């Protein structure tokens, strides 16, 4: 069934599962035409497919050329996501295929279910969590590879860097969601927090800075503070 506060720990058991977020697949700028009408111009997008246990991220880059000449693009974006997720599963060895795929928005259920009819033993599930995966394009290296792409492309990341060498996947996913929630609520502040000290760097093969354990506790406290405030600043409390 649906994923919520109460069945949270299933994410970290040893049944393979993937989160699929489609919120960055179809992305536009809205602008005015010479005649004073409004028009959209599409920009490159991405499917965010994540193994929350391992941290393996399958970033499928959606090049604008896939919208050329198509109508009802928001609807087509959901089926394109499902097609791409399904092709990903099919590309994987059987023992690497997921047993569940959890979609972050309910409109993906029917497109994915139809594309996955061939995999009756893979459960497609929604969630009631308000997960911040839309903020993934606030991660500079992910944003960069998406905007530079000239053709459809899949890029593999580990969105936890090396954290798992020191912390559990429960703790890693909690850190990840805290970081993304912060970036979603106030991107400038969140990014200031992460890079303030120039002596903490991002390895070439990583997405986030090389914080010590002690530095992560401080960072995490600053992200919490940020998030509580922006909630005051927004509701005046």
């Amino acid at each position: 069934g649906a994923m919520n506060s109460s069945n949270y720990a299933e994410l970290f058991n040893n049944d393979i599962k993937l989160f699929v977020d489609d919120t960055n697949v179809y992305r536009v700028t809205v602008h005015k035409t010479f005649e004073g009408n409004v028009a959209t111009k599409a920009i490159n997008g991405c499917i965010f497919t994540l193994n929350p246990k391992t941290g393996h991220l399958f970033l499928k880059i959606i090049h604008t050329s896939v919208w050329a000449g198509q109508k009802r693009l928001s609807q087509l974006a959901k089926w394109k996501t499902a097609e791409e997720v399904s092709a990903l599963v099919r590309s994987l060895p059987k023992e690497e295929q997921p047993k569940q795929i959890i979609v972050t928005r309910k409109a993906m259920l029917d497109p994915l279910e139809v594309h996955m009819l061939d995999f009756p033993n893979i459960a497609i599930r929604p969630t009631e969590l308000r997960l911040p995966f839309s903020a993934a394009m606030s991660i500079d290296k992910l944003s960069d590879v998406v905007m530079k792409a000239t053709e459809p492309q899949m890029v593999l990341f580990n969105i936890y860097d090396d954290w798992l060498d020191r912390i559990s996947s429960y703790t890693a996913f909690s850190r990840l969601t805290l970081l993304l929630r912060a970036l979603k609520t106030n991107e400038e502040s969140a990014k200031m927090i992460l890079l303030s000290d120039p002596t903490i760097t991002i390895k070439s093969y990583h997405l986030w800075p090389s914080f010590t354990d002690e530095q992560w506790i401080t960072i995490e406290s600053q992200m919490r503070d940020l998030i509580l405030t922006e909630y005051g600043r927004k509701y005046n409390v």
């Binding site: 087509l76 089926w79 499902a82 497109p111 279910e113 139809v114 061939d118």
Partner: protein, 300 residues
């Protein structure tokens, strides 16, 4: 005109014949129904005075034999039976018609209701949905489940309606996932009509049989089947023009005949709002949309 004689009426019961019904008292001198129109299927159905649970009844065609009812006190129900001895049948029926112990099938000469509800229904196809090949008539009741329901448990006592499933490999061609799921014309026209039903008359016939079993027996799986078949048409962009016009008439007479107090359980809000207001065929069911809006605006 034909006759369904009864050996007696030992228990109080409401008897229905087609869209008509009358109350018979315990051990009332009642010997059956006369004047039944030849040329249509018919259904004779029963609700016991004691136990409103289990409405039940028998689909039959009088051209296919001489049929009678007799209450079985072991099994506790009015059973349909066939008298092969045509001479014994004429003689028995004549005597009752003489003693005027039969109610007359009360058709109004203007009234084409029953024809319009059964236009495409044929006994031969009923007998393939209700499998009991020794008899020429078919028993249905409120509790019988459908073949698709048993997949989600007695196969002998099931309604073998054609399985329709919009999220199935049968309905979705590889490489046309989105196309086929948003526009079911492939599934309607090639898979079902051309493939399974052969023609729209067999399709419509199953649709009408499903509705009638939902309405007379409150058979839940039949209502599911009726809605599913409506939805497949309305969700198809490409539908022959003659089928749309006929569907509008079919549904029109179904909605007209539905008991007003039963609409809350027999009508699926989602399917009807979708068919009448969202689907490819939102503008193609004028008669159906007009009667639904005037008679059940609450649902929409």
């Amino acid at each position: 005109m034909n006759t369904v004689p009864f050996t007696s009426a030992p228990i109080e019961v409401t008897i229905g014949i087609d869209q008509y019904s009358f109350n018979v008292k315990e051990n009332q001198p009642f010997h059956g129904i006369k004047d039944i129109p030849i040329g249509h299927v018919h259904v004779i159905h029963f609700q016991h005075a004691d136990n409103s649970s289990m409405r039940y009844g028998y689909w039959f065609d009088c051209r296919m034999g001489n049929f009678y009812i007799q209450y079985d006190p072991k099994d506790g129900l009015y059973k349909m039976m066939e008298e092969r001895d045509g001479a014994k049948f004429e003689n028995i029926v004549h005597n009752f018609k003489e003693r005027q112990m039969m109610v007359s099938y009360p058709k109004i000469d203007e009234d084409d209701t029953w024809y319009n509800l059964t236009e495409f229904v044929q006994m031969d196809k009923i007998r393939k949905i209700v499998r009991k090949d020794e008899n020429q008539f078919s028993y249905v009741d409120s509790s019988m489940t459908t073949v698709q329901e048993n997949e989600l448990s007695d196969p002998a006592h099931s309604l073998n309606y054609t399985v329709i499933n919009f999220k199935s490999r049968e309905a979705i061609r590889p490489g046309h996932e989105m196309e086929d799921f948003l526009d079911k014309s492939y599934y309607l026209n090639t898979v079902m009509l051309q493939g399974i039903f052969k023609n729209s008359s067999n399709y419509f016939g199953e649709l009408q049989f499903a509705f009638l079993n939902a309405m007379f027996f409150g058979n839940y799986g039949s209502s599911l089947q009726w809605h599913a078949m409506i939805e497949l048409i309305c969700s198809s962009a490409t539908v022959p023009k003659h089928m749309l016009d006929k569907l509008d008439e079919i549904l029109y007479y179904q909605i007209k005949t539905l008991p007003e107090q039963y609409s809350d359980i027999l009508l699926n809000e989602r399917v009807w709002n979708i068919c009448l207001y969202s689907s490819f065929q939102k503008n193609s069911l004028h008669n159906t949309e007009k009667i639904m809006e005037n008679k059940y605006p609450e649902l929409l």
